[PDB]
Nucleic acid binder design. Structure first.
Lengths: 452, 297, 314, 516
RNA sequence: UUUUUUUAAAUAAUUU
RNA sequence: UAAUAGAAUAAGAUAUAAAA
């Protein structure tokens, strides 16, 4: 590997990333790429902008942080030579700097945003999609650039210069940024309709998912999407079935003729369901509101054999969905509680509160999960809303927890947001339960606020 | 070779073209889509660039800005298109973005009373042929002749003046060379007159003359590559038979609405030839256009 | 769950969750039947058990590896663009956002590549296991010392086991590796021979630390904590300073007296400690042994993701 | 072996206990690079200490190239070093010399900074008059090397340089000409006037001046052909004795200018191939290409050039395999040995060729008869299957066409190629034909694939000729397409160019006529 | 079926 | 004391919100 110059290293790093993010995650390719990229330096050699951008991208993708040398040298080069970063290597730099969060990364992202804003009128079919996806990866709120790019996308799509993959990328990129524009999504839908047979199921499912996520509240296109998807049910995979379940729960409109066929196909492939698919299906059923015990029994049974496969998110969603519908499965609940006790350090800020409240709402108390979640609450108290804090406090009061080292953070958080805490009517009953346990002695100022 | 076009502005499309004839805006948009697709399906054009819509309909005539004579990109005088200056700057930004020239030659603009337009010049073999009509004066003739005409045993460039009447359209719309030896002319009075004048000025010249029907707009990318793609209008089938009979490739295109507004195919596209600067003795690679290993099989 | 297409190859937020060792410094760990190459001679073991300290005959790292490790140590103390994963550290001298003439870091094996890899280095872990009677050896914690040029201070006499009173049995060892060439004018380690067996394996009283004073008094405070017999053994065997190269390693008993000199060269000096602990080790109280770590109860065996097993004689 | 005093000095330098200025480190590094008696380069603990001494010293005392040399001699050992960037002079430190030194430092040590360039230019303008004639040429050269886009200031500098035409010499004139030609945005008026000045003083030129002028004219383009004329006339009296690189530059300019006086071309080529054996690899490649482009490869021409290139054929650079491979085609001369050696070299470096180069090689070898019975087909097939992720539409078409023509049979590769081509639509018929050719080798494909192929080919049937229609029909029948809209579209074109059916008509067409 | 734009803009208020 | 350049290339789910 020593006789390879920096250009060949960049090409092979791009090849390794493409092989790893697409054809399996072989833990061998990742570690070999890490070892090779740990001993490379852009120093004393003249390199093109594209090679430096490729090295930065493939380094950052493989875990390298903003403290590594290669990353620092590439970022310094991107800062010093700004006019050499044309509109062809702008997406690579932006994608690489998306996850890096430092001063130089912010400055580079802003400079590339302004450059793409100025040249938004002279881009072609590839560049608009690549740039908009790259800017959707990072969290930026440059509205004017989005407007210019949407205008250019409409102008290009009027003449018909987009394929199925381009449509999926554009729809996902514009849905991820929460940019609600009716004309742009209408144009994308019309371009897909003109494409006709060139969109297959694999290129159709993400379109529906993104169109539901954006939330246009247009019942004219939802029906057309449902009718188009009705013919493709027999070819779908289990993951696709769960994806359309979630998408048509996001839409909010009831299509019984579609839901029945979806349920039949889901029952057909019950052996291929992982825990993620079961959690997604149960969350979609909770959101849409339909109550179908026949599929629910099979989903609960299949969830019982893949208990070890459950993540924190899957446990949270499954338990909340099961508790909302009033389904009792003592073995599944016990196994899920034990597993949640095992991985208590993987719960995020809101997943912990949802899991604790779902477990406390039904009469199921287990010390193994209770102690773990109560201890873990300290590190997620600071990232909570008023209603979420109220739910967590009620669940903790139901578990009979009295350790001050646990109760001080949640009481501080609920005192800091007292106005929104006491202005939510739906939780009023819960309030009267909480102070029924702790009493006026615990945090007197909160009691004084409660009396007023 | 890069070809530049501009999309129509639907909201501000005129209701009734000059002469009071009617136009349908949806069909105009559809026909421009068909034109863009047909241009992209051409093998010779390396890239087709699509500029953003501009409020006026006259912005669809992008070919009026400048002309390509040999290796010189001459900018036309800005005497009658004062409202189109900003459109010309915007077009030049598009040209620069694609890696073309930094700026245009301003030889004609500095000269006084030099009226001319892109469209009266025909890149004939061994030089250009200009037309002496009302839109261009004698000052333009003299300036072009002094700039580009050189007489030599081999470094020879010929400029020809072809007289035409007041009502005749620009020369490029009806008199043009195609293929390598084929002269396509409208079976009209002006076309026959131009053919006769070209034959006379340059005697002992052997090239077939093909007469199309009047009103049949056409476009042919004339170059060494000897591309035979010749775009013609859909309605006229006899011109199509004539072009096919000469050993060419007619590519029918629906051109009704644009014709009804006064815009032809030649006035809707801007063809330019770019190259990459080769620092140091250098010979950039060129794409092949012929067969390989002829001797073996 | 579902990991996004551009986040598939990332590493965990902290490197503690990474099972095994990354291939960064010396590639992959050798096979099960390939761990006999790194064994050490019995005479080194006897020298350690006699003097309380010994030096490994061979440098444990190539010079490129030492350069990379020095780069990591330099980046751990940026003070303008703070290190990522700084919140994964047990303690830092930059918690005040100002630093000083001495930078000390702890628990950095969960923060940077290479430092995590250095823990599972075979040459040192096999030696430490041999010192610990061929048992499973678990990392206790790391430490990094960086002293500035022309003003770097010196840490006075101390005993390592004085800081680990919350741990019940005496089953430990320390390995110190030099990331820069060291000598008596820049942070050399000065140790007293035969001091780990003075107070019947007991702990001497802590020394009085008075900063803003010359190095002579700081290193001469030793005559205040010892008794007459320890004074006689000191007179017979005065403390010895050890020179170290850019990669040489030194094994120290937990109970031997230990100090480092000041830095009077023209460049900063770096060194790294790693403390290794035996299998049969229990806790004494209820709670976490280190800030924000798994909590134990009564005499519980010390395991978990925070004390990974680095080597196994089976 | 280090004696006592030598060992103690080594230890003192190792401990960073000695204060070293830039001059002393430069002297020590020069001694080490000159003589290796004490093993300075063999002690990492010593050069590491020297590097630490170098970092904390003031490097502004020494010249830029001395710092570059210290950096290079540390890099050679294995230490990553970079000299510190120079700060822009401020307040009274303003002077022409320091403003030139900033650019020189950025040039030599390979630290380009657009912000510092812009700041320096914004501060050198007012004093442009005080500048001496040589400093103007130095500034022009430095700005030309840094690829600056500020063509206005370069034009101003060039005008002030022209104002002193008498002072400048031939070398300075040539340097100014080439440095102006390298700047992209320079106005054509200044370029015309500079080429006018170069046009005179023509007899004073030296071989370096000739090389500079030919480089500038090659960069400029056909628009200055007239000036180049006076060059070829000027060298018509020295042609019998010139450097090989000069004649190679002449051939390059001849090819670029599209010269048409053939007698000069023939004379210069005849003079070149006499001494072509002295050319390097790159110059040999470009002589071969330029001679090919001018239609001058006769039998002896090609024989001599191939004999000269077979020497470097053993260790050809990857970038030079494809051009000579193309030149070996399109000529009716025997080149079997060159072809075999080039194919072997191509096989050797199959793991470093980029996607474009692999596609080009597969395309060039597509129709070669002796290339079918070789390991290269299988090795390149595996490499292309691996690299399908990094291939653009042109590279995809090239590689797939070359593999299909070579008889390589692998259904998985062709299916993956069809999918990758479906990712981005096919703009042309030439970009889509290779996929059909590859898929027709096996003769089967999933019905969705053939449906998408029919949907793509249907619009493109409006402009293709009769031969393309027949080929598309053959491929579609081999794949087994049932869609009617396609067949209908192909039928109509056939009629337009062929009126109505006739007994004479080919059967297949007549079937195509039935819209099956 | 189609509906979108091209300024250097500088005047809020406070003890946070 | 130190100055020579070549390549053009596209992957895709973070637990929200009222009217031709």
């Amino acid at each position: 590997v020593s006789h390879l110059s920096a250009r060949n290293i960049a090409t092979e790093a791009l090849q390794m990333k493409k092989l790893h993010q697409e054809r399996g995650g072989n833990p061998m390719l990742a570690q070999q790429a890490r070892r090779v990229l740990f001993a490379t330096s852009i120093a004393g050699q003249n390199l093109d902008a594209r090679s430096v951008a490729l090295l930065l991208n493939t380094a950052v993708y493989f875990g390298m942080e903003s403290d590594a040398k290669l990353v620092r040298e590439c970022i310094d080069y991107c800062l010093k030579n700004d006019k050499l970063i044309t509109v062809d290597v702008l997406p690579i730099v932006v994608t690489a700097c998306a996850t890096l969060k430092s001063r130089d990364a912010r400055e580079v992202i802003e400079m590339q945003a302004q450059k793409a804003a100025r040249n938004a009128k002279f881009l072609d079919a590839k560049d608009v999609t690549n740039i908009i996806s790259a800017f959707s990866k990072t969290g930026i709120n440059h509205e004017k650039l989005f407007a210019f790019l949407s205008r250019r996308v409409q102008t290009l799509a009027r003449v018909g210069e987009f394929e199925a993959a381009h449509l999926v990328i554009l729809a996902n990129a514009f849905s991820r940024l929460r940019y609600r524009d009716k004309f742009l999504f209408g144009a994308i839908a019309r371009r897909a309709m003109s494409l006709r047979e060139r969109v297959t199921v694999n290129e159709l499912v993400p379109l529906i998912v993104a169109f539901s996520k954006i939330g246009l509240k247009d019942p004219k296109l939802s029906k057309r999407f449902a009718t188009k998807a009705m013919e493709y049910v027999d070819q779908m995979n289990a993951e696709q079935v769960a994806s359309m379940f979630m998408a048509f729960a996001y839409f909010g409109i009831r299509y019984d003729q579609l839901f029945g066929v979806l349920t039949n196909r889901a029952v057909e492939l019950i052996d291929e369901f992982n825990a993620q698919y079961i959690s997604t299906t149960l969350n979609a059923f909770q959101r849409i509101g339909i109550n179908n015990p026949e599929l629910f029994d099979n989903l609960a049974e299949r969830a019982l054999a893949v208990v070890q496969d459950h993540d924190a998110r899957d446990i949270s969603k499954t338990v909340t969905a099961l508790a909302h519908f009033g389904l009792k499965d003592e073995e599944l609940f016990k196994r899920l509680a034990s597993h949640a006790a095992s991985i208590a350090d993987q719960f995020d800020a809101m997943g912990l509160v949802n899991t604790a409240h779902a477990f406390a709402r039904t009469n199921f108390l287990q010390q193994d999960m209770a102690v773990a979640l109560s201890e873990r609450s300290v590190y997620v108290c600071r990232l909570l809303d008023a209603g979420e804090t109220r739910r967590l406090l009620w669940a903790l009061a139901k578990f009979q927890v009295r350790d001050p080292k646990i109760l001080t953070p949640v009481f501080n958080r609920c005192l800091a947001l007292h106005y929104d805490f006491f202005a939510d009517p739906t939780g009023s009953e819960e309030i009267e339960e909480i102070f029924d346990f702790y009493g006026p002695n615990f945090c007197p100022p909160l009691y004084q606020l409660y009396i007023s | 070779l890069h070809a530049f076009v501009r999309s129509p502005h639907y909201r501000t499309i005129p209701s009734a073209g000059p002469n009071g004839i009617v136009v349908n805006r949806d069909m105009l948009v559809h026909q421009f889509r068909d034109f863009y697709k047909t241009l992209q399906h051409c093998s010779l054009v390396d890239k087709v660039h699509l500029m953003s819509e501009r409020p006026s309909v006259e912005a669809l005539r992008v070919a009026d800005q400048m002309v390509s004579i040999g290796a010189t990109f001459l900018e036309m005088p800005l005497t009658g298109m004062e409202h189109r200056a900003t459109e010309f700057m915007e077009s030049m930004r598009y040209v620069r973005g694609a890696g073309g020239p930094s700026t245009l030659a301003s030889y004609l603009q500095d000269t006084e009373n030099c009226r001319c337009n892109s469209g009266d010049v025909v890149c004939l073999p061994n030089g250009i042929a200009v037309g002496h009509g009302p839109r261009t004066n004698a000052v333009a003739h003299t300036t072009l002749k002094q700039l580009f005409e050189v007489k030599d045993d081999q470094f020879s460039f010929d400029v020809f003046t072809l007289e035409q009447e007041g009502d005749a359209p620009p020369l490029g719309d009806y008199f043009g060379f195609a293929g390598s030896n084929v002269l396509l002319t409208w079976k009209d009075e002006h076309g026959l007159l131009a053919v006769d004048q070209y034959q006379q000025k340059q005697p002992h010249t052997e090239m077939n003359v093909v007469y199309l029907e009047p009103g049949c707009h056409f476009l042919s990318f004339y170059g060494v590559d000897h591309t035979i793609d010749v775009l013609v209008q859909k309605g006229y089938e006899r011109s199509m038979d004539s072009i096919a009979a000469a050993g060419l490739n007619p590519i029918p295109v629906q051109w009704s609405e644009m014709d009804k507004l006064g815009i032809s195919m030649r006035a809707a596209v801007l063809p330019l030839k770019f190259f990459k600067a080769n620092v140091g003795g250098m010979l950039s690679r060129n794409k092949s256009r012929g067969a390989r290993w002829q001797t073996h099989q | 769950s579902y990991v996004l297409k551009f986040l598939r190859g990332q590493l965990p937020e902290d490197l503690k969750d990474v099972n095994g060792a990354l291939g960064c410094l010396y590639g992959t760990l050798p096979d099960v039947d390939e761990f006999g190459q790194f064994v050490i001679s019995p005479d080194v073991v006897n020298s350690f058990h006699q003097f309380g300290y010994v030096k490994m005959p061979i440098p444990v790292l190539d010079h490129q590896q030492i350069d990379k490790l020095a780069d990591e140590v330099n980046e751990l103390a940026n003070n303008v663009e703070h290190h990522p994963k700084t919140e994964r550290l047990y303690a830092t001298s930059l918690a005040d956002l100002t630093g000083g003439p001495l930078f000390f870091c702890q628990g950095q094996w969960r923060a940077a590549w290479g430092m995590h890899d250095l823990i599972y280095l075979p040459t040192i872990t096999v030696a430490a296991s041999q010192i610990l009677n061929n048992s499973l050896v678990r990392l206790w914690y790391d430490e990094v010392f960086m002293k500035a040029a022309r003003t770097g201070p010196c840490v006075p006499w101390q005993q390592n086991y004085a800081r680990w009173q919350h741990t019940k049995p005496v089953n430990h060892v320390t390995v110190m590796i030099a990331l820069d060439t060291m000598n008596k004018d820049r942070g050399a380690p000065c140790l007293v021979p035969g001091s780990h067996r003075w107070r019947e394996g007991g702990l001497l009283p802590p020394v009085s630390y008075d900063p803003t004073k010359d190095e002579a008094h700081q290193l001469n405070t030793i005559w205040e904590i010892i008794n007459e017999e320890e004074g006689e053994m000191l007179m017979d065997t005065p403390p010895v300073t050890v020179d170290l190269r850019r990669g040489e390693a030194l094994l120290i008993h937990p109970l031997t007296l230990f100090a480092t000199h000041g830095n009077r060269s023209l460049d900063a000096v770096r060194c790294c400690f790693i403390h290794y602990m035996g299998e049969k080790t229990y806790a004494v109280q209820n709670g976490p042994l280190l800030p924000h770590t798994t909590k134990f109860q009564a005499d519980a065996m010390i395991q978990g993701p925070f004390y990974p097993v680095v080597f196994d004689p089976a | 072996a280090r004696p006592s005093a030598l060992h103690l000095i080594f230890e003192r330098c190792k401990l960073n206990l000695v204060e070293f200025t830039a001059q002393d480190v430069y002297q020590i590094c020069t001694t080490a690079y000159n003589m290796d008696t004490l093993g300075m380069l063999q002690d990492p603990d010593f050069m590491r200490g020297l590097h630490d001494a170098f970092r904390r010293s003031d490097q502004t005392v020494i010249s830029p190239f001395q710092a570059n040399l210290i950096a290079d001699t540390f890099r050679k050992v294995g230490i990553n070093s970079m000299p510190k960037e120079v700060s822009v002079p401020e307040e009274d430190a303003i002077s022409p010399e320091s403003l030139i030194l900033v650019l020189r430092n950025m040039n030599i040590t390979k630290q380009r900074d657009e912000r510092k360039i812009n700041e320096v230019l914004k501060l050198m303008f007012p004093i442009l008059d005080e500048f001496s004639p040589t400093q103007l040429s130095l500034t022009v050269t430095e700005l030309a090397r840094l690829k600056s886009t500020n063509a206005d200031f370069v034009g101003k500098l060039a005008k002030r340089i022209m104002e002193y035409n008498d002072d400048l010499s031939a070398l300075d004139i040539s340097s100014a000409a080439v440095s102006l030609a390298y700047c992209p945005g320079i106005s054509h008026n200044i370029l015309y006037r500079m080429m006018q000045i170069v046009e005179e003083r023509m007899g004073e030129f030296q071989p370096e001046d000739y090389i500079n002028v030919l480089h500038a004219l090659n960069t400029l383009g056909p628009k200055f052909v007239n000036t180049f004329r006076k060059i070829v006339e000027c060298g018509l009296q020295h042609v019998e004795n010139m450097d090989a690189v000069t004649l190679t530059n002449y051939m390059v300019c001849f090819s670029t200018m599209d010269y048409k006086q053939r007698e000069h071309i023939d004379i210069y080529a005849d003079a070149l191939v006499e001494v072509a054996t002295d050319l390097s690899e790159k110059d040999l490649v470009m002589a071969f290409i330029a001679l090919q482009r001018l239609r001058l490869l006769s039998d002896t021409m090609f024989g001599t050039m191939a004999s000269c290139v077979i020497r470097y054929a053993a260790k050809m650079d990857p970038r030079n395999i494809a051009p000579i491979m193309d030149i070996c085609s399109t000529v009716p001369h025997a080149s079997d040995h060159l072809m075999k050696v080039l194919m072997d070299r191509a096989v050797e470096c199959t793991r470093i060729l980029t996607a474009n180069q692999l596609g080009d090689i597969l395309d060039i070898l597509g129709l070669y008869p002796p290339a079918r019975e070789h390991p290269l087909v299988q090795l390149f097939g595996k490499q292309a299957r691996l690299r399908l992720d990094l291939m653009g539409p042109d590279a995809l078409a090239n590689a797939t066409r070359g593999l299909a023509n070579l008889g390589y049979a692998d259904p998985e590769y062709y299916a993956q190629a069809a999918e990758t081509g479906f990712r981005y639509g096919f703009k042309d018929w030439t970009l889509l034909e290779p996929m059909l050719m590859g898929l027709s080798i096996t003769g089967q494909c999933p019905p969705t694939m053939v449906r998408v192929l029919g949907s793509h080919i249907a619009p493109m049937a409006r402009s293709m000729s009769l031969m393309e229609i027949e080929r598309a029909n053959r491929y579609l029948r081999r794949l087994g397409c049932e869609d009617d809209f396609v067949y209908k579209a192909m039928a109509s074109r056939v009629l337009q160019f062929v009126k109505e059916v006739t007994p004479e008509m080919p059967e297949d067409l007549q079937v195509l006529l039935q819209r099956g």
